[PDB]
Design a protein around this ligand. Structure first.
Ligand SMILES: [Ca+2]
Lengths: 40, 223
């Protein structure tokens, strides 16, 4: 859920249909980056 | 910025925004042609925005200038975030005025306990998410090496300082990366990383700028 991650905003879409602030915050939640950018 | 307040217009004239589609990172103007930010904010195409207060509304004070040179520290390590600093040379010099000014580099390193000002347009929530239109400000002290190291076992290099509160509640957050930490009018840190934002016993970690004054000066002189 919460992990050591850089504080950059570089949105990423998750396999769970959710967009995370960045990839580190995605992986931190064991979710895969379905795509680069907010989930459409 | 979590737990901060809306800065007064003209209070942080050295704050810039780095864009590659949208605002991704903050930065600081150190001279009319150079900006300092975090190396992890590296992109091959970057547009720097200056004189901004409300990022969602054109206010007539803004200057949009493309980066010509984008130089990350030679020893930047992407896995540990050590030497997380980057220099950007503007394609044209910024126009200095009331909303656009430079911040000074530090003569020496800050002492623990020094009060500093942190700013940025990042998330203002530690659990949910809310990004503000107006630039946020936060006053926070530099933490001692023992406290920082106690908070992040085996993760703090000699190029990192913790600035914040062990109690959690106030801190920098996603979208604040690359932003300035100014103490006594000198840029002492650059927003870098942390374990979430505003978590109890997990203060934010920042790049220790005082270790890079020579590299900065040499790089600027040679470019
Ligand atoms: Ca604006």
């Amino acid at each position: 859920k919460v992990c050591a991650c850089p504080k950059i905003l570089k949105p990423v879409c998750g396999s769970d249909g959710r967009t995370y602030a960045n990839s580190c915050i995605a992986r931190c939640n064991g979710v895969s980056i379905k795509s680069e950018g907010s989930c459409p | 910025i979590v737990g901060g307040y809306t800065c007064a217009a003209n209070s942080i004239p050295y704050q810039v925004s780095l864009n590659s589609g949208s605002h991704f990172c903050g930065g600081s103007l150190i001279n009319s042609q150079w900006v300092v930010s975090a190396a992890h904010c590296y992109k091959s195409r970057i547009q720097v925005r200056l004189g901004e207060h409300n990022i969602d509304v054109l206010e007539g004070n803004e200057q949009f200038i493309n980066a010509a040179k984008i130089i990350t520290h030679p020893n930047f390590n992407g896995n540990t975030l050590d030497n997380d600093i980057m220099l950007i040379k503007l394609s044209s010099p910024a126009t200095l005025x009331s909303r656009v000014a430079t911040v000074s580099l530090p003569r020496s390193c800050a002492a623990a306990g020094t009060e500093c000002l942190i700013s940025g347009w990042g998330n203002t929530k530690s659990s949910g998410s809310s990004y503000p239109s107006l630039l946020q400000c936060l006053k926070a002290p530099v933490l001692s090496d023992s406290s920082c190291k106690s908070s992040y076992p085996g993760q703090i290099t000699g190029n990192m300082i913790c600035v914040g509160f062990l109690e959690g509640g106030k801190d920098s957050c996603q979208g604040d990366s690359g932003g300035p930490v100014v103490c006594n009018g000198q840029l002492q840190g650059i927003v870098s990383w942390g374990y979430g934002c505003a978590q109890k016993n997990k203060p934010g970690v920042y790049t220790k700028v005082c270790n890079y004054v020579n590299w900065i000066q040499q790089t600027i002189a040679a470019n």
